[PDB]
């Protein structure tokens, strides 16, 4: 369906995989929205007039003082009093339909694949945990850092070598997600990663 | 908290397949000796509640 370049010692070969041809910007939007929303801490809080510290005494008599009527000084009308309808601890998460998430993953990859920004790699030459090593291979693959790259592979050693780059996001293949894909300019995948990606969207 | 079903409504009424609301006729509980047989017969039937009064009771039965 789509044609994907692949770096191998045999050279830049191609691969065929069926990612959707249709992109639904709203759907991808919905997934990102759900992602960024369920990670919220919801730790904003305030005190109601009952949680405020002051007493419950009526500060001066109801009538006949020539002043306005009042109750306790915790009333939200007073300065220092409680708040009205302020924030309390909150859970912003919700359960986005699994089929939507799955479809979103496929769509996000497809969009990159369609741009030609998607690259699959067989192995990572000389990289063994050193950043200078990843830069070697990266440069060799056409990745000079002029474009931000989401690197997805299970080889911890490759992730450790590339994590500190300003232009690189790193991910275990189990961790593939549409936010990170959309954030980046290029998607680079381990064949083992590209394999489990195929399994999740299948 | 989740809404509670009104038990007075559950015992007096039924929501039909299309969402009409059907209850027994009123008026043959007692004092029937001088009522015509045409009355007692017709009052043993079920009837459909007027749209407004029907729409209200349906909200009292959220889990039917």
């Amino acid at each position: 369906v789509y044609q994907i370049p692949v770096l191998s010692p045999s050279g830049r070969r191609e691969l065929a995989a069926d990612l959707p041809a249709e992109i639904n910007p709203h759907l991808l939007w919905e997934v990102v929205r759900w992602q960024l929303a369920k990670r919220r801490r919801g730790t904003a809080s305030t005190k109601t007039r009952g949680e405020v510290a002051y007493s419950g005494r009526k500060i001066w008599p109801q009538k006949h003082t020539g002043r306005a009527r009042h109750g306790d000084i915790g009333a939200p009308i007073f300065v220092g009093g409680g708040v009205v309808f302020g924030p309390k601890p909150r859970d912003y998460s919700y359960t986005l339909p699994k089929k939507v998430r799955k479809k979103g993953l496929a769509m996000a990859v497809a969009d990159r694949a369609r741009e030609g920004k998607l690259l699959l790699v067989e192995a990572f030459a000389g990289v063994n945990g050193k950043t200078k090593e990843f830069l070697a291979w990266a440069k060799e693959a056409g990745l000079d850092g002029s474009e931000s790259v989401l690197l997805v592979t299970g080889n911890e050693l490759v992730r450790r070598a590339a994590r500190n780059l300003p232009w690189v996001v790193t991910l275990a293949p189990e961790g593939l997600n549409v936010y990170d894909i959309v954030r980046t300019e290029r998607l680079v995948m381990d064949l083992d990663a590209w394999e489990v990606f195929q399994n999740r969207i299948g | 908290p989740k809404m509670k079903t009104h038990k007075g409504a559950k015992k007096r009424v039924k929501i039909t397949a299309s969402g009409k609301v059907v209850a027994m006729k009123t008026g043959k509980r007692h004092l029937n000796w001088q009522k015509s047989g045409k009355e007692i017969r017709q009052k043993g039937r079920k009837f459909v509640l007027a749209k407004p009064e029907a729409e209200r009771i349906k909200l009292l039965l959220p889990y039917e």
Binding site: P25, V32 | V13, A23, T26, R56
Partner: protein, 149 residues
Amino acid sequence: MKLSDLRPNPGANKRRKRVGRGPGSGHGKTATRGHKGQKSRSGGLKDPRRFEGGRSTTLMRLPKRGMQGQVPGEIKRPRYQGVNLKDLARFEGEVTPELLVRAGLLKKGYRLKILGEGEAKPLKVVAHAFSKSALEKLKAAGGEPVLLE
């Protein structure tokens, strides 16, 4: 496609209605509540689904009917759920209650009863009950009804 390109469809995300914020909003002062009265108060009215101003309510004047039940409650008897022949079309070979459950046709904890809307198909269908027409269409179609217990 980048983050700046992510947008919801028109009408997907709508602005909320804020009342009580100025004349020009058309929702100022009274904040769409009108003037005075119980309804305009914080707390408002009684349940509009029932309360009728003090008179005997529409609902309460209607008579009750039927067995309402008594403590200790529901009486355990077997329950039957029907599924039509037309639903049985999707299958081939044998059908049993457990199969119809996975298909999402027969709910759990319910006994199976085959009903007659639709057409029969030469299958082995094992259930607790068949309607009169269910048996006829099934015996006619070369299907095998099996009576469970």
